[PDB]
Symmetry: D2
Subunit: 116 residues, 4 copies
């Protein structure tokens, strides 16, 4: 599908499993509208969030609940979550992979954008 989220754990050197992910889209009136949500699988991947038809142009926010992830492992992390905000499909439909790498006091995120 057009939107994919992949999460890794930099401490354990593994996928980050069962991580809650919520997607929002900015509405005409400037609010964050709930768009889709899910949790990562054993492979640290979250597929099937949306479809080519539904995933129109817009500003989207992908919020990854990293705090709940770390807390369940006994760690009190720095960040409340990891928020990735971007404009999508402004030059036509694209496939987006939002990758996140997590550490207790650090995270990085990368976008992989391909033309289908």
């Amino acid at each position: 599908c057009p939107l994919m989220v992949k999460v890794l754990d930099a401490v354990r050197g593994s996928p980050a499993i069962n991580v809650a992910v919520h997607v929002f889209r900015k509405a005409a009136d400037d609010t964050w509208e709930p768009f889709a949500s899910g949790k990562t699988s054993e492979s640290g991947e979250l597929h099937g969030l949306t479809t080519e038809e539904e995933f129109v142009e817009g500003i989207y926010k992908v919020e990854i609940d990293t705090k709940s992830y770390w807390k369940a492992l006994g760690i009190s992390p720095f960040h409340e979550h990891a928020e990735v905000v971007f404009t999508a499909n402004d030059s036509g439909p694209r496939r987006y992979t939002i990758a996140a790498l997590l550490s207790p006091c650090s995270y990085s995120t990368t976008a992989v954008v391909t033309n289908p």
Copy 2:
């Protein structure tokens, strides 16, 4: 100056200069209330954002305007901005440095918390 922000540019291998940074504090009703802002210096640093007195425990958001930074350099960016959201704790160490490393399609952020 208990809260500091330091920004690096991974493409040019230098500090990210003149980058807009907005800090917000989560209000009782869950909306984001403007708290402080500024532009990174020639050293990619932003000091004097707040004081020990105003910097009370709570949830804060640091928003770094990476999009405008990349636009000024003529490079297509992916993100609207980089947002760092965290809880300030009186117990933990005291001085917060929010460090960020920027690329057009990627960014990383780290807390460096000391005394």
Copy 3:
């Protein structure tokens, strides 16, 4: 297979294609012995470097030629290459994914280690 290398481009937000990768293993006498080599595909991935049987315990070096990659794009980068050195299989056979994210003056690397 047991060894996989994945490379992404943080500037273009894409896989890094045609990147040369050389693998070495530390010998009994302490030298770097050529073990395997290859180049990343269109997906920025390099598979088939070795086999479960061949990939024994040892200290391995994965050298990614990031300089040639950047130079072919018109960029003179900081690093000569990206070298990832690690001990493998000391607690039994594992599957290793060596991921690298490249920028002209920066790179990060992460290991994803799974028990097959």
Copy 4:
């Protein structure tokens, strides 16, 4: 002090203190010749490695002993060390800061080159 090394810990959100760092210079025969070394300070920084005079153009390797760092903290690390290899150029800016961010199974390094 034209070459500097600064190391951060992504797990504890602090400087990486007492980390061994070895610098090498590539010799004519392609072997790595010891050049300078030290341990990061309380600020995670290592200054005074070399001088403007000894720091001539050439290929240098900075080796950071991340394995020993993680072993001291009781955390299983993946890498033997972090190696940063680069060419020093007289034309480019002059002061080199090799920054590194460390996690047990991941590290990033960035050049911050200024005047």
